[PDB]
Amino acid sequence: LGLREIRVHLCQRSPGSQGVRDFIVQRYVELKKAHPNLPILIRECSEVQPKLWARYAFGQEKTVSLNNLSADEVTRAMQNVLS
Amino acid sequence: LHHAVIPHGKGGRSSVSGVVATVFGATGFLGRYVVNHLGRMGSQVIIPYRCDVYDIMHLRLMGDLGQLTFLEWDARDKDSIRKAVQHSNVVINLIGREWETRNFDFEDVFVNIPRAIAQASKEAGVERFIHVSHLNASMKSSSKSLRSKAVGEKEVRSVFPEAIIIRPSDIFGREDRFLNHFANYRWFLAVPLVSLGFKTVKQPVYVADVSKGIVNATKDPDAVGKTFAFTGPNRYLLFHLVKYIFGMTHRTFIPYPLPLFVYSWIGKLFGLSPFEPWTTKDKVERIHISDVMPTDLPGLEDLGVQPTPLELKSIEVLRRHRTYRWLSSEIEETKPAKTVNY
Amino acid sequence: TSVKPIFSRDLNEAKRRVRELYRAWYREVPNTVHLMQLDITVKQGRDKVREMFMKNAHVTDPRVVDLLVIKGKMELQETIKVWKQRTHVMRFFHETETPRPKDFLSKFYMGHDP
Amino acid sequence: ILPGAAYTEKSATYVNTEGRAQQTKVAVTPPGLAREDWKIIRALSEIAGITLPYDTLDQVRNRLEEVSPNLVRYDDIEETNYFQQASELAKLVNQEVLADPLVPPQLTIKDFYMTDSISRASQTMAKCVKAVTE
Amino acid sequence: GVQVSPSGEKITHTGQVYDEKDYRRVRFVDRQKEVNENFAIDLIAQQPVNEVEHRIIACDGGGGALGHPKVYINLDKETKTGTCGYCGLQFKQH
Amino acid sequence: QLITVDEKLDITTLTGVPEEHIKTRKVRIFVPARNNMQSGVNNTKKWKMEFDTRERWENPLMGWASTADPLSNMVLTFSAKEDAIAFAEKNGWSYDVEEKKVPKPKSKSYGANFSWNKRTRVSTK
Amino acid sequence: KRPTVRPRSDVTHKQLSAFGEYVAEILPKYVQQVQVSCLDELEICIHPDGVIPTLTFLRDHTNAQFKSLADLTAVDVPTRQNRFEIVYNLLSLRFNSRIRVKTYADELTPIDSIVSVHIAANWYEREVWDMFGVFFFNHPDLRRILTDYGFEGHPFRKDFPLTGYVELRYDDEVKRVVAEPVELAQEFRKFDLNSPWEAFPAYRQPP
Ligand SMILES: NC(=O)C1=CN([C@@H]2O[C@H](COP(=O)(O)OP(=O)(O)OC[C@H]3O[C@@H](n4cnc5c(N)ncnc54)[C@H](OP(=O)(O)O)[C@@H]3O)[C@@H](O)[C@H]2O)C=CC1
Ligand SMILES: [Zn+2]
């Protein structure tokens, strides 16, 4: 029911990961300040479709497939999971 | 839990299961199969024996290098029991004979010895002690054997609490004394029965199902103070059971009435033979005792063994009683017996 | 791709051979049980024949199926004649091995197997 | 007490300081009734109603893939970045370093040989401590 | 030089014995655990330490080809006594 | 003639290995590491293929090490990684590959031992 | 002079080398890589489809009367995609020479039989099948010759464990010899004996 921790996957140089990587350098700083006790376990792999895994109260994981989503498009996608 | 006893391997020979066992009836008929299922997996079975070293020869199979240790003992003589039940973890007492000898009564084979094994095991420090009685082991009984086992069952438990009292029905098998008995009545032109066999119900059980039950009784954490009754399915009627034995053993079937008073005295005559008698007054009564229902006891299903029907595993033992012109017949041509819930 | 054939133009043609070999076994179970004194009944013998086929029903390579059929005929030849005795025929039924469990918890209790 | 298996007794994925995931491989089966570390939690789940999904080891590696892709990549190092963002969030806090000299616990070689349960239990490592101090 | 363990069992020259509670002791019931009573630690110590003139002395089993490979010991140490590696003999000088 | 077959080559049923050693078993394709005690590199150059180790226990009688699996002792040598992979997939075993670890060429000069201003100066000989 | 090194009769190297070429250009459709070893023995590698023409030729031809089939072996090499390298050793009794003929195979690529040409192959011809699983076309009987009647395996394949997958023992529960998975009492001790030094520089394989 209540969000416990988010985690995001993305590549280094893959063009598909663009937008996730543009997201961090603009909106990551603001969010963590807004939610000090919400671990956003961002992890950076080599080749992987970007994902936004979310963890909830009991055993429950909802995930998206935010591949080739613009930087602003990620902002709404994750803001959806927060609310 | 000594590190040696800890189980190991995938289960089989050359393995360890921590079931160091002293079987006191290995030389017999049920003991052969109990040792096999202990030795098939990894178990060091100590086999006390008094017979010839030749009669125990067939038991040197069914066990890896040094998984068997043969020791001598005399039931009357104390201090040979303790020497055998000392290091064991489970003691399986299968001692039992169906007739009196010059030295041993039924009291001295069903009551005294189990007490000596039981007392010598509790002091020794065994964890379990599996005992075998008969299902019809009521004190209010007619057979001399069944009544003695009733006292032995109570006396074993009093000395050694938390014993496992196994109560099989009449066990049938290859070298048995149930199907090999009725099938041997052909040597007389007919098969005498009491009341043509009606009013008597038998619930035979296969040996492997019994031995599987005994072997799993030394593993399952529960069943440490319980009393089982390995009956098996398909309660046949003695007339229908014997008629079926001759159905597989394509010989004949000429049952006729016979009072139990004459059919016991004739049986008492065969009991005079110095050798293994063919029949005895006590075996006449056991064959003609209705088997109680298993309702108020756990049984095989509550222990992890599937009872095996008689029709499936009857040709294995009754083939040797067939003659040429009937040796190659199969299970299909027998019209199996009819079960009765009476 | 581009592999020479062996007694099979395509899978359907090789399925006919398997169906030909099955008809050879189903007609044979009732003769072995009697010719050599087996303790099984014919009804359950044919079940094992069918079971040994479903063990290999997931294969789709035409070449593999032909080799499976070739071996089966050899297995049948050794049984049509009594070259393989009661010891060998009853080896398929696995009447002694303990049924290996499937539940993970049962595997965890005994042994280190996965 | 639920006995597990040591690092020489089970296939496990350890990540080192560089972030380079590496795989142990079984050399000796664990002694006695000890079982693999991850098997106990899976078995412990099934007794309760938690019923953890994955059954065998290869499925647990699939689970590690979802939680963190880098773990399953063996002998591969991820060119991590984004240290700027961590530094910017670091400067926000208003804590002051204590006015006390910092001294590592390991100042002399005698403290090297006893630092873990495995080394502590060993008798060779205990010989070295006896030799060094003496 | 055989010593009996508290359980009454005989300890071999390798120091082995089965505990009182070990089930593997059954094999010795009605039989015996043969142990060689001529230990090797004790017998080699009862030999006298040989004294030689050189600082490097050879050692072989004694018969030449019937002994052990030709080795050379260094006898400069005075606190200890040089020991042949194959046979447990000892050498000193002076 | 020829046939069309796009399905991956698969001969698990022909070799007749029991199913208990097909799915569960794991295969390791690697180039064995040089025994660091020796400085020769002949043990390498050949891709090997072991199997996942299984339980070994002391025999209750002699203390010998007894096993319950037949594949433990088997090691197969291959010329190149690609050939080993085909064998693993062809027989249906699961496989994992550890990439070759060849030493990086190093610049050893006897003259660096005796340098006028660098720190490479060896203090002995 | 050199009592250790074997005497080298180089005459029989020239004779074999001349004959290998003679066979090479008199049967080009199949012949591949004829070679002669130090030990003066010829070796002809044949495309598998040419086994009958090559073996029939080398028997009937007047200048090559190889009528005796010494043996028909098979070498398993998992490295190469065509594993099984069937070998034919032949003998003449006329020219007093031995010639080896080699072809490749695979567990899904059978080879034509030779019992038509050399009846000696018949039993050797099954032995390969029983031990390597190399099916052979046009053979009359073709059944296992060596292994038990119930091996679902091919023992000489390098992927077959030495101890095997099954052991036989006697059981009283069923009163017949039964088969159970193998559990050795003492595991076979594989000795890693290979030395890490180039014993033979003449066979170096550059990277
Ligand atoms: N129908 C059945 O078979 C039934 C069997 N049971 C129980 O099963 C157990 C064994 O069945 P089964 O084996 O068929 O009977 P057996 O007579 O075949 O087994 C006899 C065993 O007991 C030993 N034994 C008998 N008397 C003595 C004695 N006085 N001193 C020492 N050892 C002795 C025998 O040793 P030796 O070989 O030297 O005689 C042999 O090992 C018995 O306890 C019996 O009550 C229960 C119900 C019915
Ligand atoms: Zn010496």
From Swiss-Prot, chain A:
* Gene Ontology CC terms, in alphabetical order: mitochondrial inner membrane; mitochondrion; respiratory chain complex I
Q: Which domain of life is it from?
A: Eukaryota
Disulfide feature? 11-45
Location of N6-succinyllysine modifications: 51
What keywords are annotated for this sequence in UniProt? Acetylation, Disulfide bond, Electron transport, Membrane, Mitochondrion, Mitochondrion inner membrane, Respiratory chain, Transport
Q: Does the keyword Transport apply?
A: yes
Does this entry carry the keyword Disulfide bond? yes
Membrane topology value: Peripheral membrane protein
Q: How is it modified after translation?
A: Acetylation of Lys-51 and Lys-62 is observed in liver mitochondria from fasted mice but not from fed mice.
Residues the record lists as N6-acetyllysine modifications: 51, 62
Where the protein is mainly located, per its record?
mitochondrion
Where found in the cell? Mitochondrion inner membrane
Q: Name one GO molecular function term.
A: NADH dehydrogenase (ubiquinone) activity
| Any Gene Ontology biological process | aerobic respiration
Family (UniProt): Belongs to the complex I NDUFA2 subunit family.
The role this protein plays is: Accessory subunit of the mitochondrial membrane respiratory chain NADH dehydrogenase (Complex I), that is believed not to be involved in catalysis. Complex I functions in the transfer of electrons from NADH to the respiratory chain. The immediate electron acceptor for the enzyme is believed to be ubiquinone.
Subunit composition and interactions: Complex I is composed of 45 different subunits.
> What name goes with this protein?
NADH dehydrogenase [ubiquinone] 1 alpha subcomplex subunit 2
Q: What is the organism of origin for this protein?
A: Mus musculus (Mouse)
What gene codes for this chain?
Ndufa2
Curated annotation (Swiss-Prot), chain B:
Q: What detail does the entry give on cofactor binding?
A: Binds 1 FAD per subunit.
**A GO cellular component entry from the record:** mitochondrial inner membrane
> So which cofactors does this thing need?
FAD
Q: Which domain of life is it from?
A: Eukaryota
Q: Which residues carry this modification: N6-succinyllysine?
A: 140
Tell me, which GO biological process terms does this entry list?
aerobic respiration; circadian rhythm; proton motive force-driven mitochondrial ATP synthesis
Similarity-based family: Belongs to the complex I NDUFA9 subunit family.
Could you identify this protein by its name? NADH dehydrogenase [ubiquinone] 1 alpha subcomplex subunit 9, mitochondrial
- Species whose genome carries this gene: Mus musculus
From the broadest rank down, the organism's phylogenetic lineage runs: Eukaryota, Metazoa, Chordata, Craniata, Vertebrata
Swiss-Prot record, chain E:
Q: How does it sit in the membrane?
A: Peripheral membrane protein
What does UniProt give as GO cellular component?
Answer: mitochondrial inner membrane; mitochondrion; respiratory chain complex I
Entry's Gene Ontology BP terms: aerobic respiration; cellular senescence; circulatory system development; DNA damage response, signal transduction by p53 class mediator; fatty acid metabolic process; gene expression; kidney development; mesenchymal stem cell differentiation
Q: Please give the knockout or disruption phenotype noted for this protein.
A: Male and female mice are fertile but produce smaller litters and pups have a lower neonatal survival rate. While mice are normal during the first 4 months of life, they are prone to rapid onset weight loss and sudden death after this period. They display cardiomyopathy associated with a doubling of heart weight, impaired systolic function and a reduction in functional capacity. Males are most severely affected, with a propensity to develop cardiac failure and diminished survival after 4 months of age. Defects are due to membrane respiratory chain NADH dehydrogenase (Complex I) deficiency.
Q: Which residues carry this modification: N6-acetyllysine?
A: 70, 92
Q: Keywords, A to Z?
A: Acetylation, Electron transport, Membrane, Mitochondrion, Mitochondrion inner membrane, Respiratory chain, Transit peptide, Transport
The keyword Transcription appears for this protein: no
Subcellular location per the Swiss-Prot or TrEMBL entry = Mitochondrion inner membrane
Domain of life, source organism: Eukaryota
Query: Of which family is this protein a member?
Result: Belongs to the complex I NDUFS6 subunit family.
* Name of the protein described by the UniProt record: NADH dehydrogenase [ubiquinone] iron-sulfur protein 6, mitochondrial
Q: Which organism is it from?
A: Mus musculus (Mouse)
UniProtKB/Swiss-Prot annotation, chain F:
Which cysteine residues pair off into disulfide bonds?
Answer: none
Q: What is its main location?
A: mitochondrion
What task does this protein carry out? Accessory subunit of the mitochondrial membrane respiratory chain NADH dehydrogenase (Complex I), that is believed not to be involved in catalysis. Complex I functions in the transfer of electrons from NADH to the respiratory chain. The immediate electron acceptor for the enzyme is believed to be ubiquinone.
Q: Which domain of life is it from?
A: Eukaryota
Record's keyword annotation contains Oxidoreductase: no
Report the gene knockout effect. Answer: Reduces the levels of assembled mitochondrial membrane respiratory chain NADH dehydrogenase (Complex I) and the rate of Complex I-driven oxygen consumption. Growth is retarded although activity and behavior are not affected during the first 4 weeks. With aging, results in increasing lethargy, rapid deterioration of motor ability, weight loss followed by death. Mitochondrial ultrastructure is normal, although large subsarcolemmal clusters of mitochondria are present in the soleus.
**GO BP annotation list:** adult behavior; adult walking behavior; aerobic respiration; brain development; cellular response to oxygen levels; cognition; dopamine metabolic process; inflammatory response
Q: Which residues form the signal peptide?
A: none
The subunit field of the Swiss-Prot or TrEMBL record says: This is a component of the iron-sulfur (IP) fragment of the enzyme. Interacts with BCAP31 and TOMM40; the interaction mediates its translocation to the mitochondria; the interaction with BCAP31 is direct.
Q: Which GO terms describe its molecular function?
A: NADH dehydrogenase (ubiquinone) activity
Q: Where are the Phosphoserine residues found in this chain? A: 123
